[PDB]
Design a protein around this nucleic acid. Structure first.
Length: 50
DNA sequence: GGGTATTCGCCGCGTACCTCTCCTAGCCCGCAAGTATCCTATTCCTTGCAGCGGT
């Protein structure tokens, strides 16, 4: 069981770290982006990767 | 030249997460530490020159 709201940030590319050791967040993988595009949902996707 | 066959080389092969370990090799030069050696004294003996009483 794990959670993250606002923690650290990677260095080269500003994205949340990964893994439970560091306080990282989950990964909104490619297939999930496809899935969100399949709905009419556009605002949520745009915010979720911007 | 030309239509064809055969070979060569490049491109590709699922998502998300958890645990662990390990991450250049070799030379070189200053440098700390530890040591064997060399000069430093003391005691005995036998010389060589300058003062010195004595007449």
């Amino acid at each position: 069981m794990h959670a993250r709201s606002t923690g650290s940030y990677s260095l080269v590319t500003q994205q949340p770290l990964g893994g439970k050791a560091q306080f990282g967040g989950q990964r909104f993988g490619e297939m999930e982006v496809w899935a969100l595009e399949a709905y009419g949902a556009a605002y949520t996707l745009q915010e979720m990767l911007t």
